[PDB]
Amino acid sequence: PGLKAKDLVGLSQEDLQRKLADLKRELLSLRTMKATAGPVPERIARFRVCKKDVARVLTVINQKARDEARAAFEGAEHIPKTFRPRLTHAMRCQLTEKQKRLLPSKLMKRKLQFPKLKYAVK
Amino acid sequence: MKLNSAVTASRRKCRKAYFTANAETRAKMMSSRLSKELRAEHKIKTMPIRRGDIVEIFTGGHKGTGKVVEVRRRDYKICVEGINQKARNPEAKPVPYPIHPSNCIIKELYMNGSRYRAIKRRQERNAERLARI
Amino acid sequence: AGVQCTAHSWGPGRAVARLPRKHGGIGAYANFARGGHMAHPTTVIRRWCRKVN
Amino acid sequence: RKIRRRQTRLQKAKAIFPCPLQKLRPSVTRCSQKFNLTQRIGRGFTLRELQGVGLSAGKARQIGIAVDPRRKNKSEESVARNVARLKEYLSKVTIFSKQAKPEEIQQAIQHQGVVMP
Amino acid sequence: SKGTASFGKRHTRIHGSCRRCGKHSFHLQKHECASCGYPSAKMRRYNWSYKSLRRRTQGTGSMSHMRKVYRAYNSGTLKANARKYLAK
Amino acid sequence: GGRKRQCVHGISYGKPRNIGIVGLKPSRSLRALAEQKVGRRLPSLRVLNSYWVAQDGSYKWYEVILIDPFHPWIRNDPKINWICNPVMKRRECRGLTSAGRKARGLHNKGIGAMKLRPSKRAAWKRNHTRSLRRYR
Amino acid sequence: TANKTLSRKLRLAKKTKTNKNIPRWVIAKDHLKKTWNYKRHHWRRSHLKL
RNA sequence: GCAGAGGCCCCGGGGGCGAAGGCGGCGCGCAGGCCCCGCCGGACCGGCCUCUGGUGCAGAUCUCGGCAGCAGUAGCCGCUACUCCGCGCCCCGGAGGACUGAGGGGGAGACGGGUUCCGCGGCGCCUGCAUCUGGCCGCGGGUGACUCGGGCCUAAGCGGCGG
RNA sequence: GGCGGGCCUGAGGCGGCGGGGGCGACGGGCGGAACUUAAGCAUAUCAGUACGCCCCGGAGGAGAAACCAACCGGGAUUCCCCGCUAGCGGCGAGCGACGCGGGAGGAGCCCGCCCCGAAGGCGCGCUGUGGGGCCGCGAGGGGGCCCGAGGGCCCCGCCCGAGAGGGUGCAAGCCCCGUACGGCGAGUAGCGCUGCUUGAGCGUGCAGCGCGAAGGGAGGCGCGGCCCUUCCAAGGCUAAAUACGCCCCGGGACCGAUAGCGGACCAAGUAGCGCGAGCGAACGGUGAAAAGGACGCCCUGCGGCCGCUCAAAAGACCUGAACCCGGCCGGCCGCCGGCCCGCCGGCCCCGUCUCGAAACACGGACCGAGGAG
RNA sequence: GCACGCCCCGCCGGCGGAUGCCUCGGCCCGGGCGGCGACGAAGAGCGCGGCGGAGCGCGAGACGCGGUGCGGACCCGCCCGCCCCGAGAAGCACCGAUCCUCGAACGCAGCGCGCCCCGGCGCCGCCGCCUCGGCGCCUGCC
User: Which of C25, D10, D45, G12 could form a disulfide with D49 if both were Cys (CB 3.0 to 4.6 A apart)?
Assistant: First the structure.
């Protein structure tokens, strides 16, 4: 097993960016060794661990940048599309329940004048 | 009869479930009766078979006692230590005879820490059932 | 069933039989043919329920 | 379809426990000379029938009496037959108001089927 | 000459690969796809052949976005939907 | 003017009743054609209704009222928020405008309109449906 | 052909890259029994891009 | 007679102490058919009443699958041609004898094929005879551009254009 | 002739937002056949269908009477039951609604007009805004015989709010999983002429054009008068009952590998074919367990042999038919009848149309499966 | 004569895949659902596994990555990696991202070529806004 996300989440972006370059340079060496292995290698277990390791560091960097940007554009009118609530295409274009339940003033007053009574029949 | 119509009594659908089950379901399906000493000790009738378990097979060929050394979930069969196929020559690797988990009774269990928690979780749910569900 | 194939008869004059055949001459669309429709296919419009007074 | 329709009625009934599913609808002569002397249920009470019990269209609908402003009585007898029918319903109807006393709203029995068939 | 001899003079490709459908159906002289319909924005589908419709349709591919969004609707996208329907 | 059928070389091969290309009269009025044309030109907007403004010997002019369903004033208005509903998308393509409903005959009720109510096609389907009940 | 385009060459090179037999270890792992790829093509009997 | 359904089969029909099926042979029936016996086979099967049908084949230039005689038959008769020795193959090496005969059985490109290219090993497939050969099979490789071509220009043409 | 400003019509950019394309069903809008039926064929029918195009939604469309009726009347829409007739039609073949009545389900409303006028949704707008489901336990069997292996046989119990099923080495309520039991109103109406359409018939609904109302529409035979009943078109919204594929879920007197989807085979719309649109296969099953063949012998080797693993080779596979073939082994040759059985006697090739077939009429090499009231 | 060819007194062997038995598949019938897309759909192309063809599943963070809650020992070959009261194999759910080329397909072509500040650069609408045209209706000014 390789890097754990918990150790990476603590690291600052600058340390995380060095961590990625080192794993990327290591990956070139691991791939070079496989190219020059000739007859057969030793399963190169390090190769998979450092390909998943590059993924974890990049994943943490994205969360570090995504959260930062979500905070900067918080409550601003017209925030970026990536941070907008997911919904669907139809749900964005559907009317809000308030807008759907909006009534003309004459239809609102009359509905108020006769409220829905609860009654029983013998 | 079964009053939950949501469940299936179709031979085809039920057999597909067995043949193509998720691993978590295959493991429970592969379970064995605990010995009467273990039944008094843990108060649970059956536990899913693990690797480190001493088991007594009451089956026809290969009846015996052994500790499981391999669990083959895909074949739905376990291989105890000791029970093996007849070897064509003495100088050959011994092949374990696969035994069904249902064909054996557990004599010892690998307690671990999760197995202790699992026996406790079942004991609690069984106690609630015993209190007039 | 049996009618998703595109089969038209090769016709008289090829020393074959006159039944519908596909592109290679494989017999099709006929009760006798392998993969042909039933001559009178079962239907769900059969009356299943009888009436009793 | 019978099962689905029963469930829809059962769920709608649960949503308004004291209230009956069916509104009071009028007694109307079956149209044509072939059924002149029989009566059937009609869409709603005329505004003349409503004035016999002294109820506005809003109040009548709020207490579960259907109102048809299109219907015209066509006879003095129809108004009286329908006015009588409203009086029976008004005596039968019980209005649960001024804070829902749960035991008394739970005590209430939903009427099922046509009201006064 | 009507047959085998004239088959020898075949040495050109009238149909190339289609950008949208990846099929040897893109006429290269007329610049149109026989099956895809490309360059048209509407895909070319005809109800006379349902077999062609079955060959390229929703479900003959990954159906990635749709599969995930259908699963999400079954789980927790309806509740998120209710929050934006409540709106301000 | 009247419709001319799009049959090449002026020939509609078929039974004699269908051989005619220049005397045909359009099935939908010009008021309806106008709405459908301004619906294609502007697919984003919704079509309320059309009025005649002018006519000449070759052209009739009709004026159409189109509503932006996504404007705040239209969405936050109880009177016109109905158009914002997605079912009202391209109403002139589906004959739901007054001119389109005139062509379908829905401007008429009772005798004569009995076989064209949900739709002419839907009446045909219901009338010609063979209902095989379970107890028949 | 010697004057090909990269976009025709790269779709042809996929076929050269994937004209391979099932690795022997894959047959052993899956108990495949049928060991022929069946999507393999021999240049003389084949008409790719046709 | 077939295949299913709802029943029955007096301690709850028959079955690894051998089901269905296959192969032979009795018996019984006017016959459709049925039964039993031995053998092979290796998990299911019915008799009777009531019920339902996608319910019985010699034919259809019937469908699909197999496959016979013909028959060790017709054929393996374009491109002048092979031979000796060396592991000796139609392979390779040497010696002969020739052929394509510069609009070539020569050396190269365009297009079309798409790895056929190269080295190494191999003959199970293929090489319509053979093979130790190979365009076949396995394994590993192989196409390097400021100057060559694309790209660029316009041609016949084609697309674009408030409308 | 210039020079600014307001109004109005446009032009370029920029910002926010929105559209586009997909889905073999259901739904709305259009364009629209022919084969066919009429025993011919023009009208008709097929069919207001296929198919082309456009457009939504979870439903859509329809929808609160310019409605039906003729009553001791009803009362938006949709859907079901019903009459299937009234009518239409070379009044031919065919075609064809509706009102009643019984149900399902029920719910109403708005704008213009007019009144007030910026109080409004206030960069606009007085050419009018605003107001009037997941989670979860889960019962109870032993002894003998025998078998490769009980899930079999014999004795004898136990649990059943669980004897639905699935698996396990043979047929399992008690071996396992589960099952039952839980929990949290105007270019309009109309009319004239034309064309399409309808059962609508001197006109059912539409439509082009010409003309163009003011009290007007309807009442299933036109036209003119007079009544009576009954409604208010030329603007808009609307739930429910209803339809339905993909996909998910259950069930079946369904099919059982030539069947059932074209496709049960780890790669089926694949392999393959066509320049293309398109076309389109075949292929299920070793065993309980891979235990997938011990060892010896002879091979240049290929491979033989002996036997091994197994209950069994079941050895690349369950059973293993018919056709056809080879070894050995009888016999001399088809059918029917008699007899010890190779002699005598009888014996054309069936199906088929046909007056009549052994026909030199046609189909049929053989065998298996499929194959038609 | 013999052989052949038949016939079959049996016995044995091929050849083929019938017949049985089965069966994670169809097919019908009910329910449920009705949930795509410029926040880039459907579809397509390429690539991605230690040893990797097809299929699947992913997308240069690639046979996957992170979070939370279950779960609790394996991961078809060879591996190497886990193992231990949590340390964490298979598996399960839900969420956060990544998401190459093409495609409604969006700087322009389809594989080649720009303009431009680093933000970018498609079209058509709606509503604002900014700039400004007119011997349109005018009004001053000259």
Answer: D45
